[PDB]
Amino acid sequence: VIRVPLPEGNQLFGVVEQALGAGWMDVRCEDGKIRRCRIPGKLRRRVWIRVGDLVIVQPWPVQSDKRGDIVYRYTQTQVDWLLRKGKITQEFLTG
C-alpha cells in the first residue's frame, strides 16, 4: 500500500529551481510564484535536496508570496504517484 504525504493547509507543491547556499533554495511553486525557501536543520540532516526535486513548501505567514520553508522532499516514485493522481502535472515538473 503506497502512501504519499500531501500539502495541507496553505502548503504548496514546488520544484526546486536553484540552490542559493547555506540551507536556502529558490522553489517554483504550484501557484506560479517563486519563493525563497529555508531548509530547516532537521530536514537538512535527513535528506539531500537538489535542483529539480519536488517538495512541499510552507509559505511564511508574512511575505507569503515570496518566502517559505521546505517541509518535505518527494522521492521519484512518489512524484510518479502524484502525477498519476493528478496532484501535479508533467508540465509543472519540467517548467
UniProtKB/Swiss-Prot annotation:
Entry keyword Protein biosynthesis: yes
The keyword Nucleus appears for this protein: no
Domain S1-like stretches: 1-75
Physiological role: Seems to be required for maximal rate of protein biosynthesis. Enhances ribosome dissociation into subunits and stabilizes the binding of the initiator Met-tRNA(I) to 40 S ribosomal subunits.
Residues of the full protein shown: 13 to 107 of 113
GO MF annotation list: RNA binding; translation initiation factor activity
Protein name: Translation initiation factor 1A
Organism superkingdom: Archaea
Similarity annotation: Belongs to the eIF-1A family.
Keywords, in A-Z order: Initiation factor, Protein biosynthesis
